[PDB]
């Protein structure tokens, strides 16, 4: 796909607020562009193989990915359940150098890679600050749309390459244990849906709301870069489970967090009843976005009309009844879930 | 995230003939605060409509309670009209005794 | 009258295009889709998107030393520009009209420069001692498609006044809002904060003394220290009542140490006249002005320039700026509203057509 | 039951009038006791409840400076956020903050949360675990790193377990006459013949407190949660609340249809029949 | 206050000395930074302190082998020494630094100094050598140097002290802490050998410093843990409730001494519940928070034993548990959810509690399936496994099982790396289960139980 991702280096210093500077990545003769700041122009050399292959097949002509970069230093996982990941009181030496959270929030696939760059930009070659990817967390469905009542599959594939350093801590050659953590943040709810630590053993917080995650390294090779699977299988998606589902891959002093908005849609059913016409709408979701239109078959129906309050069914789906007071008379419902033409109902 | 207001017109007491009551138009769930809620007595705006403070809610939405006194009568149909930044045309919700 | 331009095709005789680059944009004489008058609003307009422009006009050389200089011009952003500039530049006699590059040797730059929401400010830059100096003040420049007047006045007392639409928008002195001689008053480096000058002042025992009541023992025997009956002091040696921290323990004896006592305020280094200060009264003066140029990069072409005036009298420029811009503005805005109503009618018709096509597709 | 105490702050950017509007309120249960309104000329924590009225003016000035400084920080935060999101200055944008704690019936700590939300989209929140923050976008991620750097989670944990809960007990004790009170609903139930083949039965939970009530329609002893209709609890105007539940029924079959009303102030769940 | 010991001047200024390697990004170093500064202020003159920002000078950490941050390491006269193994708080650093400041064996010059030294909260080895050139004193000096980081050594030559102690040469006496005095065990133990040898003295101290019932609370932590021990956890704060601690340790002491006279090997210890509250989780003891002392056993092999019975003030429960353990009847306590008595169903619900009863059964072939709740693979495999169970319920010799592997510790050679893993244990092969890593289909399962199990499977 695009070999140059125009991005935005968000600065984290409190004195300068959240000021943005330019600076663009470069996947895979590096094309030079002097406009960018030499510190924030990274030639992403990816040994994991996940990011460059993911955006290699990314559709051509797509809008520019909404990349956002910033500096972050590795702080240990705050949640108690992840303590097993970091049980020592000393920070490993392999985490030397700077760390950048590159969150490519493209409309088709999210991502959150951890780039550890080199100290200085290239002098003899073009101004490129070489960098290495460590933990890529790519989601293939950044905005799923599950019909009410069925289950949702929140894709989440991560890839890890251990930080290469002089000291090799190969005590247990193979895939290190990690902690997956899914979390819904819908208008001040903040429920911990599930937290898992494959490989390691401990008393995890109970998976809530029937959620199960396929969290397991696909490979078990002793050294090779490991591409794990962390999809979220939430069954019977009810309206209260709508919202952004941020998923975090926890590694020793590493966090890869990506969000995705799970929109729930339930196509309505319409009915005209016998004078004052009552366009009654059956169970549907989401509550908003509905637009009643009236037609005398055709032309816009004359006569004054009003709406009814949302009669919340306990499941979450709502139902309203538009009343009009004035061949055939038809009411057309305009809801995003149903075909935008409108599942209209007519009485002749 | 411009959520639409959810009008709920009612009265503090069930409607009865010749008894004062409070047509509390309860507008809730909207965002942002740019709102105008006017009660109507058979199509015309009511002048003395005391409103309550822009009370906030836990789910990041406001809710106002525009209440005015009236004597439930079977000749006029009280209504609540609400215009906002998200809804295209001011919603007009009639006051129903049963609902 | 240093320079006058109303565009009332002879302008190409007095306007010249540089040949420094092979991709310079082409200017066209036009009044735009909407205007206040068909002929009065005629002016140069960019007609090529995402290209550089360089157009310069020569005139009689003159100097601003000892006399007020006023520049005046109207810019129309009818195309709703997203990135570009309406600024103009004053060049000396030595400037080459045919070789005007992106940044030629100029004296004063005055006019808007808009490229995105963040940048929406008037860029006024002056040359002094081989340096381009911008203003430290944030002058906001109008962004809507209507024509907007812009005026600069500099009196020989190194004072400046910037006006927008015949209305005063900024005023001040050159030697105070720029970086000509930034050392004006320097704080004394050796003026360190004295040890006796307390900043976080605190006085102990203002209206209190040692209570001696809170000075209770740290650990006291437990009130319910009942020895177990099965305990044998013979085998245990000597049973003792368990002791615990007393509820009456406090922070020793704090005599209500309150703040803001005998406070002389925060100490600062006193400032003295900087010896590096050297403002010049002739800062506003220039050797000569020979060319009026406009070298600007515009992503979306359609910017109209008209009503150029360079003179020495404030009232003269103000009167002509009024009698041109104000006369234009009315008919401009009413006609514009008329065509906007026509456009909105067309959009509503298109929306109705789309809705009926969608309904027809639904019926099938 | 469980009680709540919350504090809300809301900076609404009003383009054309200079400084953004700033509204700060405090809620014990769902009854406000302080409301600092920036638009009003008083510009103080004007009280609205008896349990807060009997406070010395020094306390009022303390909350005054507190909320003033919070507003001074919040307006700069709104400005920098509006700059970050790349959004038009002409539009009105809202930034909201809230912090509070929930106690159980025994008075001990039960829950604590502080949340921030820009434009109504949850910005950054403190987990109910009181240990880790959750951040949706990356501006919230930067703010999360900033908080974790200072270990202010150990500060808020001090407040939420401490001063928040202590103030909540003090308010519930001084104002025990009006907040700890519960009131059973004066329930009704009505019939409406929508047609000759169906009818609507609507049981009214009317005039109760607090709003945590549940109405369910047992059909022949089995809860028919699927086809029951209900409106959200609506304030009545004089402090209490009122709700409304409904069910569609075959005409003239009102034998086995029980509107269970459950409320804290009731001695036991009640049963209704027509 | 400390000097930054970068590489270019490291060996120049390393020439005791305490240097802490640190990395600015890590929160651990910044947490102890004010504590480290306070320790430097409180240890001026005795031991110099220094900071090293390893992120700049890689050579220092590469040579010193410092793979962590912080990794406080002491340098005795510019010579690498043992890493500081203790709390990173200022108080602990100061305590260990003052311990290092003194010589290997403290030379007592006055009798009052002798009482002051033996009055310390920890055990104290004291040597009495009238002759300065005696080989016993030199051997004691090397013994002190070798075992310095574990025991408090002192030596003296006062005539009264030497005469009141041994007065025959190699006068090594171990004074146990003054707050740990008891009856059945003598407070003072004398060294009895022909010649004082560093190895012999070290072995003598290792076998005699603990006696029967030591108070091990964050000190001597390794010196006791590692053998077949017995820890009683209970409120242990002497400066506030020394009487209760003495009472409970005396109970444990008398029962332990009774069984020691009976002639069995089992070391004992008492611990404060708060200090070792982290270790209470390993024994599944939560937080008793009561005056009753909880008692637990770990053996050298790693087995864990817990009393469900309350620790009686008479001591009957203690001796009962001791004789039970010596007989060897109680089952190792592994973290196990309370098994339901309703183990009915096509698939048998196995827990670590009854894994031996069900899975380790001798006259049946069992197929077990380790599964986790959040495991999506296991949730997907559950219905097929249930159908397998209901189909093969007619086979008496074979039963399939599932044991939750996150809330129930997997026992036996059985080991799970990735859920869901399935294992097959034949009737006469309980020691060598086979890991069924083939397909995951119901028909494949039926085929496998047709291939392996001797008894013909049912449908
Ligand atoms: C929110 O989201 C919106 C999207 O909707 C963002 O909008 C985008 O904004 C970017 C800019 O940030 C736009 O990028 C533009 O892309 C064009 C091609 O697509 C570029 O041609 C254009 O290039 C300008 O910027 C680059 C980078 O800064 C410069 O290198 C380049 O030269 C252009 O800048 C010149 O032109 C500007 C406009 O005229 C001037 O303001 C600027 O100063 C600079 O001027 C030079 O060129 C002129 C002409 O030759 C010279 O005369 C000048 O010299 C004279 O003036 C200087 C001082 O200015 C004196 O020192 C000197 O003495 C004088 O001679 C200069 O040499 C853009 O990069 C993008 O198109 C937008 N998209 C949309 C859809 O709108 C928005 O940015 C977002 N918000 C935030 C906050 O990020
Ligand atoms: C991560 O794990 C999930 C869950 O195990 C994988 O999703 C599902 O994986 C199965 C196994 O390959 C897929 O089944 C396949 O289905 C196709 C079409 O139905 C069929 O032709 C194949 O023979 C096979 O049975 C399934 O499609 C797939 N997706 C679902 C269930 O939505 C996922 O592939 C794993 N890897 C990731 C996410 O990178």
Numbering used by the authors:
A (entry chain T): 1 to 28, 33 to 278, 291 to 313, 320 to 348, 358 to 379
B (entry chain B): 1 to 99
C (entry chain C): 4 to 11, 14 to 369
D (entry chain M): 1 to 274
E (entry chain E): 2 to 16, 23 to 466
Q: Which text from the study accompanies this structure?
A:
Major histocompatibility complex class I (MHC I) molecules are central to adaptive immunity. The other PLC constituents, namely calreticulin, tapasin, and ERp57, function in recruiting and stabilizing peptide-receptive MHC I clients, whereby tapasin serves an additional outstanding role as peptide loading and exchange catalyst. Upon binding of β2-microglobulin (β2m) to the MHC I hc, calnexin is replaced by calreticulin, which recruits the mono-glucosylated MHC I to the PLC for peptide editing and quality control.
In this study, we determine the 3.7-Å single-particle cryogenic electron microscopy (cryo-EM) structure of the PLC editing module reconstituted in lipid nanodiscs (Nd), which enables us to identify pivotal features of this supramolecular chaperone assembly. 3D variation analysis depicts that one editing module was always fully assembled, showing tapasin, ERp57, calreticulin, MHC I hc, and β2m, while the second one was displaced and lacked some of the PLC components. As major interaction hub, tapasin contacts all other PLC subunits. In addition to the non-covalent interactions, tapasin is disulfide-linked via Cys95 to Cys33 of ERp57. The high-resolution structure allowed us to build an atomic model of the N-glycan bridging the lectin domain of calreticulin to Asn86 of MHC I hc. Whereas Met114 and Ile130 of calreticulin shape the glucose-binding pocket, further contacts to the N-glycan are established by Asp118, Asp300mc (main chain), Tyr92, and Trp302. A well-resolved loop of tapasin (residues 11–20), henceforth referred to as editing loop, is positioned on top of the F-pocket of the empty MHC I peptide-binding groove. Thus, the structure suggests that Leu18 disrupts the contact of Tyr84 with the C terminus of cargo peptides and thereby contributes to peptide exchange catalysis. Direct contacts in this region include Arg187 and Gln189 of tapasin, as well as Asn127 and Asp122 of MHC I. The latter residue also forms a hydrogen bond with the main-chain of Gly192 at the tip of the tapasin β-hairpin, which additionally interacts with Lys58 of β2m. In contrast to TAPBPR-MHC I complexes, the empty peptide-binding groove of the PLC-bound MHC I is in its widened conformation stabilized on both helices, not only by multivalent protein-protein interactions with tapasin, but also by glycan-protein contacts via calreticulin.
